[PDB]
Design a protein around this ligand. Structure first.
Ligand code: BYH
Length: 114
């Protein structure tokens, strides 16, 4: 429970841009193993993560520090590289989204205030 200048930057700057990105749609909500037909998804991915959950957590002061939030973004991206075949379009979409993420994090203000 906490609001800091970094967490605010992750919510209003970084996540805002990632969210409406043209390749964001598969990431805005939890992966639906049933709907998408991957009955083995949850046997391989033990810690599912998606942008909806991350956004909600930033809106409820769930995070104590920005690093905990960055870790969730990383898990979401990593889940995708681990589970899918190397050639899937989804892998390309996650790498594209992750580069934005890393680029924005590099400019995250360092004052870790509040
Ligand atoms: C296979 N595949 C699926 S399903 N979707 C849409 C459902 S959202 C989603 N997030 C994932 C994160 C990791 C793995 C599968 C994931 N599926 C795709 C969209 C575009 C291209 C390929 C796709």
């Amino acid at each position: 429970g906490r609001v800091t200048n970094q967490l605010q930057y992750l919510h209003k700057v970084v996540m805002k841009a990632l969210w409406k990105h043209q390749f964001a749609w598969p990431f805005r909500q939890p992966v639906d193993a049933v709907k998408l037909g991957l009955p083995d998804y949850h046997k391989i991915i033990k810690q599912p993560m998606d942008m909806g959950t991350i956004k909600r957590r930033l809106e409820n002061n769930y995070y104590w520090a920005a690093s905990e939030c960055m870790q969730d973004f990383n898990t979401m991206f990593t889940n995708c590289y681990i589970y899918n075949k190397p050639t899937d379009d989804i892998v390309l979409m996650a790498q594209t989204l992750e580069k934005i993420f890393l680029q924005k994090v590099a400019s995250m203000p360092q004052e870790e205030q509040e």
